Amino acid sequence: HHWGYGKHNGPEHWHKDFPIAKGERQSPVDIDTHTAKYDPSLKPLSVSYDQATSLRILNNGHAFNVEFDDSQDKAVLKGGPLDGTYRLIQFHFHWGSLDGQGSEHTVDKKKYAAELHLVHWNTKYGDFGKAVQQPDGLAVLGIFLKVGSAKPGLQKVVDVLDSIKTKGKSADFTNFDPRGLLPESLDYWTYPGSLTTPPLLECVTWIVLKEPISVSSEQVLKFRKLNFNGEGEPEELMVDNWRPAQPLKNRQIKASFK
Ligand SMILES: NS(=O)(=O)c1ccc(NC(=S)Nc2ccc(F)cc2)cc1
Ligand SMILES: [Zn+2]
């Protein structure tokens, strides 16, 4: 697999190796805020990150992932649309070459500068690899980023990026608290979807927060200094690593709020 985000290997090409790219529950999607309906059946959302144990940060050639110890129930997501318990495994971002693009989900066609994805797997399936084969295997918490004031809780991530510039580089990243990446409100939209990168598996319950977080121009500029390429290869800046909105088809987006 040589997929990426370029003209020659980007989202318009993915279907050839991954035919589910044209499936019935692909992500991301545009969230039409007028058509999303308030759902009183949604239980309260519970984000329990007090015991989260970060381990490492990795440039995987597509984004960077902050990885967690998921060998026990240390950082979990429950409630909302979810049945049972979902364990945090990693977070990553998608972002643009400029501040007017970068998010995967859109809100009434508005694109944000970036989007954070906190990835969790359903513990009833035992491991991540088994969970991704199930329709209710993952829950991804999506948070929009807009450019304005700096996000203090992001700065530790920004400051380590110089050490993982190129594909395959990693750095120890212990003691990072993901609580510092959340907005105040947990109001959200939810719908059934997919991974937004190959293999595009239709295993995700998406939970997209309504309230963006603010980050500074300086913070996002540092994301844009990363490289898709490996060390000693021609430089290709890691920007515009987002998939565009996909057809909603036979899905409804539910709102947790009135
Ligand atoms: N952008 S996203 O939808 O949140 C997203 C979240 C997670 C992943 N894949 C990961 S962590 N590894 C993986 C490896 C082998 C598989 F067969 C399936 C997934 C991709 C996209
Ligand atoms: Zn993602």
Contact criterion met (CB below 8 Å) for 67 and 172: no
Pocket test for ligand 1, best of 87, 140, 194, 195 (most atoms within 8 A of CB): 195
Q: What share of the chain is helix, strand, coil (3-state, %, to 5)?
A: 15, 30, 55
> Which are the contacts of 32, defined by CB distance < 8 A and separation ≥ 6?
108, 253
At 90, the amino acid letter reads: Q
SS3 category, 127: coil
Q: Is 85 annotated among the ligand-binding residues?
A: no
Count helices and strands (H / E) in the chain.
Answer: 4, 15
SS3 category, 243: coil
**How many whole angstroms from its chain centre is CA 161?**
18
Burial of residue 143, with CB atoms counted within 10 A of its CB: 0-12 exposed, 13-18 middle, 19 or more buried: buried
- Residue 143's nearest CA partner among 243, 86, 212 is 212
Contact criterion met (CB below 8 Å) for 170 and 57: yes
Cα three-residue angle 158-162-163, rounded to 5 degrees: 110
CATH class of residue range 1-258: alpha beta
* Tokens 């295997």, residue located: 137
Q: Which residue in the list 13, 62, 105, 120 is annotated as catalytic?
A: 62
* 37 Cα: distance to centroid of ligand 2 (angstroms): 25
Does the Cβ of 244 fall within 6 Å of ligand 1? no
Identify the residue whose C-alpha is closest to ligand 1 atom 8: 195
Partner residues linked to 188 by β-bridges? 209
Domain residue spans in the chain? 1-258
**Which two structure tokens, joined as six digits, stand for 134?**
């199930």
Catalytic residue flag (residue 62): yes
Please give the Cα distance from 229 to 33 (Å, whole number).
Answer: 38
Please give the Cα distance from 95 to 103 (Å, whole number).
Answer: 6
SS3 category, 153: helix
Please give the Cα distance from 194 to 162 (Å, whole number).
Answer: 31
Does the Cβ of 117 fall within 6 Å of ligand 1? yes
- Residue 142's nearest CA partner among 109, 108, 100, 186 is 186
Residue ranges in 18-123 assigned as alpha helix (H): none
Residues in the chain: 258
Cα three-residue angle 179-180-181, rounded to 5 degrees: 90
- Residue 180's nearest CA partner among 147, 208, 131, 214 is 214
Does the Cβ of 195 fall within 6 Å of ligand 1? yes
